[PDB]
Design a protein around this ligand. Structure first.
Ligand SMILES: NCCCN1CCN(C(=O)[C@H](CCCN=C(N)N)NS(=O)(=O)c2cccc(C(F)(F)F)c2)CC1
Lengths: 8, 252, 26
C-alpha cells in the first residue's frame, strides 16, 4: 500500500 | 518495467504518476509537457471493457517522484485535475488506435530539479529518430514481472524501435500508423518491456542534434510483459500532435 | 524552449548511466 498523503 | 533498472535521481523529471484517490493506488504513468498539461494514454482513463471510466475528481497527479509508495514531502508535487480530454477517435473497441489523452491541471506546477517538462516532436524530429534500431527509453512504477513483484523506485529500460513488418507479424491485432513497437528480438539476447502499471508513461529519445529529450511514444499496449517474440506497442506522439495542439490552443 | 533539458543532467553537462546506449544506436 501507499503512504498517506496530505491536504490534496 | 520488466528487466530494467533503478532510475537515477532526476533522470526522468517529466515522469508523472496518475494516482487514484480511493482506494489509494497507482493507476498509470503519464508525462509533464508544460506547467499545466499532462499527457497519458486514453486507456488509462477510459476502457469500457473493464468498466473503467475515471473522471477528473477520481484522480490526482504526482510529479517529481522517485519512490513508488512513499510521500516524498519536499520534493514531489501533487496536483488536482481541471479537465480530461480524450482523443475523439480513440478506438477502445478494437485495437486502442489513437490511445492518447491530455489532462489540464487546476494550477501550474513549479519546476524544480525533479520536475521539468519533456519536449514534443515535430515533423523533422520524428523522421530522423523514429527508425528501426534506434533506441528509446521507457520508465514507470509498473510491475517487475507479468506474473509473480513491484518496484520501490522508478524503473528504467532502453528498447530499440522494431521494423514495422516484424511488429505486425508478432500479433493478430491490427496495427495502425498511429502506433509503433519496440523491444528486443528473441535472438538479440537482451530483454525488457513495460508492464501493468507502466501504461500511459513516456517512451523518450534524446536528440543527437540538439541534445534534448523528446517523447516519441506513450506506453499503450502489449500481449503480456517481456514475452519472447512479442513487442510493446506505443502511441505515435507525432502522428497525433495536431490533436494535441488543437486542444492546447483551445482550452489552454 | 527549455523542454527536455534535465536540471540534474543536461543543465549541468552531466550524463546519466545509460544515455550512451541510446546515442550509440542513432
Ligand atoms: N488500463 C485499462 C484496461 C486495460 N489496459 C489495456 C492495455 N494493457 C495491456 O496491454 C496489458 C499489459 C502490457 C503493458 N505493457 C505494454 N507493452 N504496453 N497486456 S494484456 O494483459 O495482455 C491486455 C489486456 C487487455 C487488452 C489488451 C489489448 F489491448 F492488447 F487487446 C491487452 C493494460 C491494461
Amino acid at each position: 500500500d501507499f503512504e498517506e498523503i496530505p491536504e490534496y | 518495467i520488466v528487466e530494467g533498472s533503478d532510475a537515477e535521481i532526476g533522470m526522468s523529471p517529466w515522469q508523472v504518476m496518475l494516482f487514484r484517490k480511493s482506494p489509494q493506488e497507482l493507476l498509470c504513468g503519464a508525462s509533464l509537457i508544460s506547467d499545466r498539461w499532462v499527457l497519458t494514454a486514453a486507456h488509462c482513463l477510459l476502457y469500457p471493457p473493464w468498466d473503467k471510466n475515471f473522471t477528473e475528481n477520481d484522480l490526482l497527479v504526482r510529479i517529481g517522484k522517485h519512490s513508488r509508495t512513499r510521500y516524498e514531502r519536499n520534493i514531489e508535487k501533487i496536483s488536482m485535475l481541471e479537465k480530461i480530454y480524450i482523443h475523439p477517435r480513440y478506438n477502445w473497441r478494437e485495437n486502442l488506435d489513437r490511445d492518447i489523452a491530455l489532462m489540464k491541471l487546476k494550477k501550474p506546477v513549479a519546476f524544480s530539479d525533479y520536475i521539468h517538462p519533456v519536449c514534443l516532436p515535430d515533423r523533422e524530429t520524428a523522421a530522423s529518430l523514429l527508425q528501426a534500431g534506434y533506441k528509446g527509453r521507457v520508465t514507470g512504477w509498473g510491475n517487475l514481472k507479468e506474473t509473480w513483484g513491484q518496484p520501490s523506485v522508478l524503473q528504467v529500460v532502453n528498447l530499440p524501435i522494431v521494423e514495422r513488418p516484424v511488429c505486425k507479424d508478432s500479433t493478430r491485432i491490427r496495427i495502425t500508423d498511429n502506433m509503433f513497437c519496440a523491444g528486443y528480438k528473441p535472438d538479440e539476447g537482451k530483454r525488457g518491456d513495460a508492464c501493468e502499471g507502466d501504461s500511459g508513461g513516456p517512451f523518450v529519445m534524446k536528440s543527437p542534434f540538439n541534445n534534448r529529450w523528446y517523447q516519441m511514444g506513450i506506453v499503450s499496449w502489449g500481449e503480456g510483459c517481456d514475452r519472447d517474440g512479442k513487442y510493446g506497442f506505443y502511441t505515435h506522439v507525432f502522428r497525433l500532435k495536431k490533436w494535441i495542439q488543437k486542444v492546447i490552443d483551445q482550452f489552454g | 524552449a527549455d523542454c527536455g533539458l534535465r536540471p540534474l543532467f543536461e543543465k549541468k553537462s552531466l550524463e546519466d548511466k545509460t544515455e550512451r546506449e541510446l546515442l550509440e544506436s542513432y
